[PDB]
Amino acid sequence: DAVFGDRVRRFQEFLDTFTSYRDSVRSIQVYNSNNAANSTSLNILPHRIIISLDDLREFDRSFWSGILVEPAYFIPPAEKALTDLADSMDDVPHPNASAVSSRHPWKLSFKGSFGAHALSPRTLTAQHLNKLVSVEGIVTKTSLVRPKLIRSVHYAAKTGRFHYRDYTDATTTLTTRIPTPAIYPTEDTEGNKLTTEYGYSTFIDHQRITVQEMPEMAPAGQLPRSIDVILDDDLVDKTKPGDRVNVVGVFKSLGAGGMNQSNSNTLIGFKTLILGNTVYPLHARSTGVAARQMLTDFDIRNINKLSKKKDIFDILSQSLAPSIYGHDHIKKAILLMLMGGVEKNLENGSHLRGDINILMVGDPSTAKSQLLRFVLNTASLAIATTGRGSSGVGLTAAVTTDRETGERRLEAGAMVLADRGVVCIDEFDKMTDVDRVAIHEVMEQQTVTIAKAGIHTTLNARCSVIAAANPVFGQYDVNRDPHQNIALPDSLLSRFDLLFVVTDDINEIRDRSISEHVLRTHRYLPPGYLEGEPVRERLNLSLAVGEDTEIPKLVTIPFLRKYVQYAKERVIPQLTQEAINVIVKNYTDLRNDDNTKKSPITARTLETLIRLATAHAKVRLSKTVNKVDAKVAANLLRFALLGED
Amino acid sequence: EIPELVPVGEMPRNLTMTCDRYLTNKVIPGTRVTIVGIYSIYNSKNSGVAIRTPYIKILGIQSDVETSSIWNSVTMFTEEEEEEFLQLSRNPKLYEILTNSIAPSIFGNEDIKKAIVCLLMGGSKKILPDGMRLRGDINVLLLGDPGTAKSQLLKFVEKVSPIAVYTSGKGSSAAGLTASVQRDPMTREFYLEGGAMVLADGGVVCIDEFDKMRDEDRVAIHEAMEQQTISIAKAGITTVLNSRT
Amino acid sequence: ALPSIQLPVDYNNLFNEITDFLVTFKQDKGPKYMAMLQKVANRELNSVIIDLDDILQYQNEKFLQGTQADDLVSAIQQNANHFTELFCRAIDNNMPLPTKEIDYKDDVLDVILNQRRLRNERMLSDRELFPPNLTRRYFLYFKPLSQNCARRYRKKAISSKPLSVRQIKGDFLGQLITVRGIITRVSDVKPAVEVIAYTCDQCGYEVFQEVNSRTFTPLSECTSEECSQNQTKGQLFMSTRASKFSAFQECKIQELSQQVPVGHIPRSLNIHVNGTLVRSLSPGDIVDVTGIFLPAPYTGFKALKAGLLTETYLEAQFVRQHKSDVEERVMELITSGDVYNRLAKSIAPEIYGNLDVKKALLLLLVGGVDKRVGIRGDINVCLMGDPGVAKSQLLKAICKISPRGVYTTGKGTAAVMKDPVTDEMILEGGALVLADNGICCIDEFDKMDESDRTAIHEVMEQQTISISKAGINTTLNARTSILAAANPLYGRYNPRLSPLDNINLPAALLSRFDILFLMLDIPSRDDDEKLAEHVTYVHMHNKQPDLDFTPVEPSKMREYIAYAKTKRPVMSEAVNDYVVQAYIRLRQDSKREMKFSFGQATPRTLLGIIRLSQALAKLRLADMVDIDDVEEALRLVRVSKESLYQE
DNA sequence: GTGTGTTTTTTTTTTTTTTT
DNA sequence: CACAC
Ligand SMILES: Nc1ncnc2c1ncn2[C@@H]1O[C@H](COP(=O)(O)OP(=O)(O)OP(O)(O)=S)[C@@H](O)[C@H]1O
Ligand SMILES: Nc1ncnc2c1ncn2[C@@H]1O[C@H](COP(=O)(O)OP(=O)(O)OP(O)(O)=S)[C@@H](O)[C@H]1O
Ligand SMILES: Nc1ncnc2c1ncn2[C@@H]1O[C@H](COP(=O)(O)OP(=O)(O)O)[C@@H](O)[C@H]1O
Ligand SMILES: [Mg+2]
Ligand SMILES: [Mg+2]
Ligand SMILES: [Mg+2]
Ligand SMILES: [Zn+2]
């Protein structure tokens, strides 16, 4: 075990070389000590340290190569060295009589460049076993959090002595050791009865998730492939199904593969999985950034400056989908949806939803699906759905069975996963009626209920619904009222804040402008691409893993996403009496209007007006709603209903 | 087994085999290959007495549609055949040669043959920075009187196209065209199995008897023939795969 | 080998200080816990609730005068299981003698004690025998710490902070924690064996075997000294009379909707309650349960299959629910506030207009009483209304204010059988039976299938639903007041179209309802304006625009119904005469109207009028059914009938 | 002392198919 | 795997 000590001491020398890790350890220890000294508080920092592989390579290339080649013999010594360093500089406070027994090993985390070890579940060949690799994918299945024993403490009530027995498993420790029968020793060696001392025994949270590659880099004619990852201790519950992620960990192998006289000729392989060491939640489909995008002070200052622009609303609306010609009011409604109004959690169980749900029905090839595709590519949490390609069980909740434990469980559907997000439903008229009541309940009360298979639960899906629909006929018939032109119940239409009618009327000047714009779009050439060259995709932009006035016509899409996130987080507008007068006046005028006879205008339209005013106040970043918000909301609603302007 | 080699009134016989190392991921389902291997035996414990499961251990593959993907989405083209392709591209009458090379047994139908050539070539896929994409496939429908070799044209297209799936109008279900949610018999878990049109990813699907589409089955292709994507939300599975067919 | 570790807990000093605490604690009669132990000796109590506040106060007292404590409050939150046995042994050591003439007619354990003592003593002179748990007729539980509001709560006292299921990390195993959550499934009471009391066929010996493993093996081998020395090899016979059993219940508590992060699924936790805490929980309970968090093992062969991955449960110790003085108060409200008008607005303060529908809701909440048969005291109304009218909000408010009130949509009741394969339970409930002595708020009554149609029918003329799974024909009582919130088909209601043609419900079922109202919205200049003002004010202040008396508590209706149920306002002979001529003239005007045929007067309308008058007098003292009562009931009925003929 | 035996599952959810 | 047959 001399090599183990040599690796330990070289790692400690490396740690002393870069004191930033020492400062991070000190900060974590003092934060935990202060929280312990300070009440309804439960936020405790973990015993994990994130290092950069580049610094290790610069200091000792041999150690870095051993880490990236055979981590099973290099990371345990590093963990021991980190634990020794932490204890040495530990504030040595009064022991809790538990931390002495309850071990707290200091986990290791990694970031930086990985090279050929940045892989995908499809490309994870068997040659990478026992080698540390980084794999990107989507979380699809998550087993229930299940603690497991690693160390049992027992008290002998005949000698007054505490005996500990450490338990090891192939899924717990990297180095292979004899599995322990997981039996508590009830008797001492000297015939003394031992009582199992819970609380002083040590258990760790364990989880088993499934990570599969991107559907979009999945090769033609092949379905995405998946691997199993074992998150442990801190990493449990840090991810949920439907999350894009990049995990860094050891590609380990388990099982007997037959080879036990049970299967001598049978050709079954071995169990392969990943013991996750680091999780980095890349999201927003940008391939390298998280959903909660970091906001620099310069970006916040620029956002504040642009908030003083008079027509910033119009600029952002037009900057949404530049490649989509026209449809300006639709873009305004989309921008309002992406960053909507406030949700009122009233008393006595009353609940007023703040999400905006818009149904837009129109003629074929009117960019109805492309608008939803753009919203999917832009929104922080957007889930795609097809009316034909969807089942209510697969839309809300599915009663499956667990495999790690072997018993019943619920799995989230398409809208539950989109909680606090947006659901883009194409071919809305094509949805099955039996499962259409479920989405109706969703958009009605933002909650689903399950009362089957001995499971009586109520899940929350506070999503914003955008739907694209086609007329009953091949095209819309303006000679008919907008009830028979739609094959959906008017009760289903009522819960939508806005219903947008798209007509593909054949103009000449407008058609010429559309054709010119579409041709300008189609003649675009990517910067790093030549003419007559196929647009190949690799997306291996993860060169490093982890964190490693003004009047512009159109802003960049990531900047717009940052602005939307900052607005949703920061400003909580308050409705104002000046907006109240305008809202009530417009609601009264629209309600008792002759042209509004065909309209379904009811009290829900007042809720739509309030939500639109709140969203428009969010657009201005004003912490209170104002008259201009009410005027713009009334104009947009009047456009949605009548379409005159 | 090859459909042309099945016995009369007999369903095709399946047979399991195993690749190894460099032979792994050499082909994809739907491809016609030839295998030289060892006819081996293993005893599965899953209903007679002293029965033994037969299989093949592979020692060679001879395909004609290249490796996984379309030659792994890159050129496996040797210099001689590439130079021959360049020489063919410089033929001024190449358009006429290709038109005459489409369904030679089918008389006339020159415009249809030229449209088939255009479809087999297809446009260039465009991916804008803003996020939405522009497809590069061509969708062609052939209406007309029966007995005009339209089915023969579809069969020839399926024969000549590197990736092609030929389907019948009546024998077609929406869950069988794009994706089927099936429960795993052993693990009791649901999973997706690619449909007919998915197997034709990057190629072409020749749907005969298009008038015999079930109205609930015909609509299921509206998204995928335009967006080139298939959205599935079933049995706790929510995915959006690509089908550029 | 078994390695050893050193831990500063000092179980011996802790036990001695525990004895000192029990003996020498006098809360601000003698010591409280010595009084409780004496009462236990009097067989007047078998539930020792160890309050953490008492231990904390004892530590506070002795800290000022010697610091003779080791922070036991923090010391037992680390491993409460051992301290439970420590407290049990302390109670047994300081167990007082009985100070009451308790009858010992059923003293089987005492009989066994004295018999075995005499049997041992007759050879002891040569001319522990009993388990410590067996002698105990009591059970000990822990009461969690209250709020501190002091520096002692320096993130400590984990039992004082209500956790959620997701907050229960594996490190908390062995701690005494607490959770806040809603039950979903409670098991039945079952006898779990504590110690078996085998008796040998020969050698006359009885051997005890304590078991805490959820599964054990019989002895059936006379290892007793006499049997062993004689080599008789007698088999042991299990004896329920001398064996010790404990009532047990296994609940399955889920986490509240607020404790679930976005895009996640609520979890569950199994709770093992035993002793006198059994039967203290129901599925419809939202509670703060404090107990010991323990890793229930896969003892047997499944442990080998699974490994170190164990399962967890909570050994609950304390439960706190969340959910004629009031009688004098409701007379005060009656004299001050006009219930007919004030409580009408109180039902739907946030809903503007439709005050008569609110009064009908009050009458339905009160309900008639004609239990004598020869009928029914349930008032039923259907709110067909019009899409866009706040019928759903009215039903939600009724559900939140009516005791045993449940709300559901037409499309989701009914019943199910043997939902879990493992336990194979019997006769699961539904939604209609949930509001047995309550009201069911049926939204989407139109979008409701023939099966539930016949179910709610059988309920409404039977006050009971029935199922026939396998010819069992078992039935579940549901005397539920029916509150329907259907809406006219094809969206908006058509006044020109007949009301029964506007809704896809059978006319027979509709006529059997006691009363029905058309409340459809019509675009006006002022009513919409005032409603918009109301909604805007609610948005401003998160509260109603209080312009009148707005009582909140619904227990006033509870007092009214409980008071006047026994009273049973007797109909007067003049009442019967006036209602009989009322029926005569109502049928006459129904014929002379024959414009919609639904306006025909029926004896069912007479039953509805009788029960409405009964409810009216039920709210107003007793025997108020007179000319005024029947006039009010007939006015309401005629208003409802004209509502169908509105415009 | 050599060699066993469990724990161990068919629900709910899709997809098809014939009637209705 | 390991305790019970
Ligand atoms: N122009 C043509 N040249 C050669 N053969 C032809 C031509 N038109 C028709 N045929 C023959 O006519 C037959 C047509 O059969 P199919 O192709 O199966 O039917 P179809 O023409 O597609 O029309 P359907 O399927 O009945 S609507 C084949 O035997 C063809 O060879
Ligand atoms: N008189 C009213 N007072 C207050 N709010 C009202 C009133 N009428 C309607 N509302 C509002 O309208 C909404 C409730 O309408 P709903 O009850 O859902 O309409 P509906 O007739 O039940 O349509 P359904 O659900 O298809 S039957 C809430 O936002 C209420 O605030
Ligand atoms: N206003 C527009 N500007 C630019 N392109 C448009 C517009 N309307 C339609 N298109 C084009 O039509 C094509 C198909 O649109 P699609 O999303 O299928 O509409 P729909 O869902 O109504 O059929 C898209 O490729 C898009 O480029
Ligand atoms: Mg489209
Ligand atoms: Mg044909
Ligand atoms: Mg409603
Ligand atoms: Zn005996």
What is the secondary structure of C406-450 as a DSSP string? EEEES------S--STTT-------STGGGTTSEEEEESSSS--H
Please state whether at least 3 CB pairs lie below 8 Å between chains B and C. Answer: no
Give the residue, by CA position, lying nearest to ligand 3 atom 13.
Answer: A365
CB pairs under 8 A between A and B: 164
Q: Annotated binding residue at A366?
A: yes
Task: Tell me the residue type at C636.
Answer: L
Measured between beta carbons, which residues in chain C are less than 8 angstroms from residue A348? 397, 400
Q: Which atom of ligand 2 is nearest to the CA of C385?
A: 21
Answer yes or no: are the C-beta atoms of A181 and A83 closer than 8 Å.
no
Positions on chain D within 7 A of a protein C-beta: 6-16
Phi, psi for A484 (deg, rounded to 5): -75, -20
Ligand nearest to the CA of A503: 3
How many Å does it take to go from CA A271 to C1' E1?
A: 18
> What tokens does B111 get?
């415009």
Helix (H) or strand (E) holding C129: none
Torsion of CA C60, C64, C70, C73, to 10 degrees: 0
Residue in chain B closest to A392 (alpha carbons) equals: B234
A47 interface with C at CB cutoff 8 Å:
no
**DSSP letter (8 states) at residue C98:** P
Ligand nearest to the CA of A491: 2
Tell me how far apart the terminal alpha carbons of chain C are, to the nearest angstrom: 93
CA proximity to C107, closest of C287, C201, C242, C14: C242
Q: For chain C, how long is the longest CA-to-CA vector?
A: 111
Torsion of CA C145, C146, C149, C152, to 10 degrees: -10
Task: Give the closest nucleotide to C307 (alpha carbon vs C1').
Answer: E1
B139 interface with A at CB cutoff 8 Å:
no
CA proximity to C208, closest of C219, C216, C197: C197
Give the residue, by CA position, lying nearest to ligand 3 atom 20.
Answer: A365
Angle, nearest 10°, between helix axes C80-93 and C11-23?
A: 50
A88 interface with C at CB cutoff 8 Å:
no
How far is the CA of A43 from the CAs of A28, A39, A390, C155, in angstroms? 12, 11, 40, 10
Helix extents (H) in A60-170: 61-69, 75-88
The span from the CA of C163 to the CA of C291, in Å, is 12
Q: Shortest Cα distance from C99 to chain A (angstroms)?
A: 34
A189 interface with C at CB cutoff 8 Å:
yes
CA proximity to C135, closest of C82, C29, C210, C222: C210
Answer yes or no: are the C-beta atoms of A198 and C174 closer than 8 Å.
yes
Q: CB-based burial of residue A83 (10 Å sphere; 0-12 exposed, 13-18 middle, 19+ buried)?
A: middle
Distance B156 CA to ligand 1 centre (A): 12
Q: Shortest Cα distance from B162 to chain A (angstroms)?
A: 13
Distance B152 CA to ligand 1 centre (A): 6
Spatial CB neighbours of C42, under 8 Å, sequence gap ≥ 6: C98, C99, C100, C102
How many Å does it take to go from CA A53 to C1' D19?
A: 68
**DSSP letter (8 states) at residue A193:** B
Which residue is closest to D12 in terms of CA–C1' distance? Answer: A399
Answer yes or no: are the C-beta atoms of A322 and A374 closer than 8 Å.
no
Measured between beta carbons, which residues in chain B are less than 8 angstroms from residue A392? none
- Technique employed here was cryo-EM
Which residues does nucleic strand E approach, with CB less than 7 A?
A 181, 183; C 217, 301, 304-305
The span from the CA of C364 to the CA of C615, in Å, is 8
Substitution target in A591, A606, A609 with the highest count of C β-carbons within 10 Å is A591
> What tokens does C52 get?
């953490």
- Nucleic strand D near CB of residue A410 (< 7 Å): no
Residue pointed to by tokens 């590197």:
B162
Tell which A residues from 120 to 179 touch C, by Cβ distance under 8 Å.
Answer: 144-150, 153-155, 157, 160-165, 167, 169, 172, 179
- What is the edge-to-edge ordering of all strands in the sheet holding B53-61? B17-18, B53-61, B35-42
Distance A626 CA to ligand 2 centre (A): 26
Residues around ion ligand 5, judged by CB within 5 A, are B 151
Burial call B188-199: b when 16+ CB within 10 Å, e when fewer: ebbebebbbbbb
The span from the CA of A210 to the CA of A400, in Å, is 15
Spatial CB neighbours of C128, under 8 Å, sequence gap ≥ 6: none
Task: Give the closest nucleotide to C306 (alpha carbon vs C1').
Answer: D7
Residue pointed to by tokens 């009187």:
B145
The span from the CA of B67 to the CA of B82, in Å, is 17
Q: Which residues line ligand 1 (CB under 6 A)?
A: B 106-109, 146-152
> What tokens does B133 get?
């994409």
Tell me how far apart the terminal alpha carbons of chain A are, to the nearest angstrom: 81
Is C309's CB within 8 Å of A206's CB?
Answer: yes
Distance B155 CA to ligand 5 centre (A): 9
Ligand nearest to the CA of A513: 3
A451 → closest Cβ in C154, C266, C412:
C412
Q: What angle do CA A572, A578, A580 make, to 5 degrees?
A: 80
How far is the CA of A382 from the CAs of A53, A337, A367, in angstroms? 34, 12, 18
Answer yes or no: are the C-beta atoms of A251 and A124 closer than 8 Å.
yes
Q: What is the CATH number of domain C324-640?
A: 3.40.50.300
Q: Annotated binding residue at A367?
A: yes
Is A180's CB within 8 Å of C308's CB?
Answer: yes
How far is the CA of C84 from the CAs of A159, C208, C292, C457, C609, in angstroms? 20, 21, 10, 55, 63
Count CB-CB contacts under 10 A for residue C532. Answer: 23
Answer yes or no: are the C-beta atoms of A363 and A476 closer than 8 Å.
yes
The span from the CA of C315 to the CA of C294, in Å, is 7
**DSSP letter (8 states) at residue C398:** H
How many Å does it take to go from CA B200 to C1' D17?
A: 27
Residue pointed to by tokens 């009233």:
A346
The span from the CA of A20 to the CA of A36, in Å, is 24
Burial call B8-38: b when 16+ CB within 10 Å, e when fewer: eeeeeeeeeeebeeeeebebbeebeeebebe
Could you tell me how far CA C490 lies from the centroid of its own chain?
Answer: 41
Ligand nearest to the CA of A346: 2
CA proximity to B169, closest of B121, B243, B221, B226: B221
Bridge partners, residue B241, by sequence = B230
Spatial CB neighbours of C217, under 8 Å, sequence gap ≥ 6: none
Q: Which residues line ligand 2 (CB under 6 A)?
A: A 491, 603-604, 607; C 350-353, 385, 387-393, 487, 531
Substitution target in A138, A223, A365, A411 with the highest count of B β-carbons within 10 Å is A223
Binding site feature residues of C? 352, 388, 390-392, 487, 512, 604
Strands A422-426 and A464-469: parallel
Count CB-CB contacts under 10 A for residue C398. Answer: 23
Query: Nominal resolution in Å?
Result: 4.2
Residue pointed to by tokens 């279900």:
B173
How many Å does it take to go from CA B241 to C1' D12?
A: 25
Give the residue, by CA position, lying nearest to ligand 1 atom 8.
Answer: B148
How many Å does it take to go from CA C301 to C1' D4?
A: 13
Please give the sequence-ordered ranges of beta strands (E in DSSP) within C164-310, or none if there are none: 176-186, 190-200, 206-210, 236-237, 244-255, 268-274, 286-294
CB pairs under 8 A between A and C: 240
CA proximity to C557, closest of C375, C376, C361: C361
Spatial CB neighbours of A233, under 8 Å, sequence gap ≥ 6: A46, A107, A204, A205
Measured between beta carbons, which residues in chain B are less than 8 angstroms from residue A213? none
> What tokens does C291 get?
């107990």
